[PDB]
Design a binder for these strands. Sequence first.
DNA 1: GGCAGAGCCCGG
DNA 2: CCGGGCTCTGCC
Length: 298
Amino acid sequence: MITNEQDLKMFLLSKGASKEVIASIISRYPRAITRTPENLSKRWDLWRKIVTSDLEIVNILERSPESFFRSNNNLNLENNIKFLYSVGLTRKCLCRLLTNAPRTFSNSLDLNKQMVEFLQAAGLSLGHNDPADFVRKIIFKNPFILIQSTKRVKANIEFLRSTFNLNSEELLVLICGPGAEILDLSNDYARRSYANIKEKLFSLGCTEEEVQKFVLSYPDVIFLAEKKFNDKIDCLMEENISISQIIENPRVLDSSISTLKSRIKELVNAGCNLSTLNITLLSWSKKRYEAKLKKLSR
DNA sequence: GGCAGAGCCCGG
DNA sequence: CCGGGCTCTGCC
């Protein structure tokens, strides 16, 4: 007769998918083979409400198969698309959500309604006439946000606000820009992350002011596990990069313990001036590092 | 963590 | 204006 795999191959070919991409994908997701011709075709039609071509859709399924084959809830999916569009999100935003936070659409419509309802309350109470732009800007900058609880999101905003003594305008920029991903963290973790940074930098001599600015200038520092932030700075000072230095160029903490290490062990171990070079290159790309250590030899 | 395009700033 | 070196920024 005809197998589960047969149906999906047929379907997928009729969408413009190479026999290879089809095989690729199929190996990666067993449960893909268990959706019906009908279900599939409705999911695809729905995805085409956002995605503009079957081609685009395909790339996605090739990088991200669970993205499509996970849920078989077309009604939920359909209502979320309707609702999200209705509150005035843009095709791009929905595409970004699709490709970054797919479970948004397998979500409960009530949940998304609740967060948008919240996001509206927030743009408002931050001195925004029409909160519509705020909501769009925040969802575009943090597409993982609709899959958070409003309690989490609500607490993290309050946390930023009072820790940092930010006003409405200052808080707004924070959460639509640098501190955006922060709202997706467990509140408790966020509260302990920053507590550790404070204790760790103070013990190195830093002031309140100096700490606030440090975290404000690169909020994603709060993501580092405590031991991993602690370990990392301990390393930078063994190589005797100065705290001031660590603080002035915060993104060096993006490198891993082993990488920055073995790179000054060639900038100072070879011959240069550590406490004068802006260690921005430290974090830099290999291709992008080698080429400056080049002009730095002479 | 690594990476490099887009755009920006500086010596020329 | 222009040619390169760097940052900011957002994808793998």
